[PDB]
């Protein structure tokens, strides 16, 4: 039941127009913010040069170029590093490898050396099918468990016989809402307590992570706030559970369609 050649062209045309609409609206939303940021940085640099007689713009440019190059490495220059705080923590390495197999790819931490890149390529290629098999198995198992639970929920007592599929739709909408409430809506509050993030920033981080976009501007562990009680393993297990459960819901929806 493969799609018609002309049909595929219609979906492709729709995707292309979709992307054109998106590009125009991000352009119009987002150019003023970086216009003001460019103005702010150029005015700040001019004030710094004007106020400091001793400093030379060539030396300042060389120092800023070195600092931005350092940012690529991932080490923050603003704070003095103790050097018992290590970016590649066993916990951090576990979280990074988990994101690599999970295909999130935040990007705040990444391999830099030649072997690091080669091992990252090999590790991703070998790991991704394994995680895919795990997710498919957990999704199918959870789907069966959910369907038997659905049978238990449909007691058939005081149903009020309004419609045959009325309670099927009501149960599906209430389970999906409950799952979203616990998986996406509730962790956001934990994130607000732990890191003081805004509501939009936290909900955006959770959607980006569970949708496996992984922009990396917002990451679970950053800026030395001394997280406590095994923050990296619990958040990675959280990501696995959320991705699996929604993979199950999507698979069930597809089964219903078929």
Distance of CA 215 to the CA centre of its chain: 6
For position 76 contacting a second copy by CB under 8 A, the verdict is: yes
Asked if 175 and 196 touch (Cβ cutoff 8 Å), the reply is no
Q: Which is nearer to ligand PEV, 194 or 213 (CB)?
A: 213
Nearest residue relative to ligand PEV (C-beta) = 246
Token pair belonging to 8? 């595929």
For position 246 contacting ligand PEV by CB under 6 A, the verdict is: yes
Q: Which of residues 12-51 bind a second copy (CB under 8 A)?
A: 12, 14-15, 18-20, 22-27, 29-31, 33-35, 37-38, 40-42, 44-45, 48
Identify the three-state secondary structure at position 15: helix
* 184: partner contacted, choices K ion, a second copy, ligand PEV, none (Cβ within 5-8 A by kind): ligand PEV
Closest among 118, 58, 57, 108 to 87, alpha carbons compared:
108
Helix runs in the chain, H state only: 5-51, 57-73, 90-102, 114-153, 166-180, 186-195, 199-210, 231-257
* 183: partner contacted, choices a second copy, ligand PEV, K ion, none (Cβ within 5-8 A by kind): none
For position 245 contacting ligand PEV by CB under 6 A, the verdict is: no
Map residues 113-142 to x or -, x wherever contact with ligand PEV holds by CB under 6 A: ------------x--x--xx--x-------
Torsion of CA 214, 215, 219, 224, to 10 degrees: 140
Exactly one of 59, 79, 211, 230 binds ligand PEV (CB under 6 A); which one? Answer: 211
User: CB of residue 67 vs K ion: minimum separation in angstroms?
Assistant: 25
Give the integer Cα–Cα distance in Å for 248 and 256.
Answer: 12
Q: Which is nearer to K ion, 214 or 222 (CB)?
A: 214
Each as own residue / partner, the long-range contacts of residues 230-236 (CB below 8 Å, 24 or more positions apart, any chain) are 230/91, 231/91, 231/194, 232/89, 232/91, 232/92, 232/94, 232/95, 233/91, 233/94, 235/95, 236/94, 236/95, 236/98, 236/99, 236/102
Asked if 146 and 175 touch (Cβ cutoff 8 Å), the reply is yes
Q: Which of residues 172-201 bind ligand PEV (CB under 6 A)?
A: 180, 184
User: CB of residue 119 vs a second copy: minimum separation in angstroms?
Assistant: 7
98-106, 202-210, 219-227, 231-239 -> range binding K ion (CB under 5 A): 98-106
Q: Rule CB under 6 A: which residues touch ligand PEV? A: 102-103, 125, 128, 131-132, 135, 180, 184, 207, 210-212, 243, 246-247, 249-250
């Amino acid at each position: 039941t493969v799609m018609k050649w002309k049909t595929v062209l219609a979906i492709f045309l729709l995707v292309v127009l979709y992307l054109i609409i998106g590009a125009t609206v991000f352009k119009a939303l987002e150019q003023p913010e970086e216009g003001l940021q460019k103005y702010r940085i150029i005015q700040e640099k001019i004030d710094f040069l004007s106020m400091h007689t001793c400093v030379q713009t060539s030396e300042l440019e060389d120092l800023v170029k070195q600092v931005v190059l350092a940012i690529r490495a991932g080490v923050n220059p603003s704070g003095h590093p103790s050097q018992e705080s290590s970016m590649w923590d066993l916990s951090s390495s576990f979280f990074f490898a988990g994101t690599v197999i999970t295909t999130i790819g935040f990007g705040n931490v990444s391999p830099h050396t030649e072997g690091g890149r080669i091992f990252c390529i090999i590790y991703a290629l070998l790991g991704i099918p394994l995680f895919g098999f795990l997710l498919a198995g957990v999704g199918d198992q959870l789907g069966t468990i959910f369907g038997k639970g659905i049978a238990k929920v449909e007691k058939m007592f005081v149903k009020w016989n309004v419609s045959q599929t009325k309670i099927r739709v009501t149960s599906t909408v209430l389970f999906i809402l409950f799952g979203c409430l616990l998986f996406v809506a509730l962790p956001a509050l934990i994130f607000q307590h732990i890191e003081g993030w805004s509501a939009l920033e936290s909900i955006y981080f959770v959607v980006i992570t569970l949708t496996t976009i992984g922009f990396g501007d917002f990451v679970a562990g950053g800026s030395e706030i001394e997280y406590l009680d095994y923050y990296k393993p619990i958040v990675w297990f959280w990501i696995l559970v959320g991705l699996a459960y929604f993979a199950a819901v999507l698979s069930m929806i597809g089964d219903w369609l078929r």
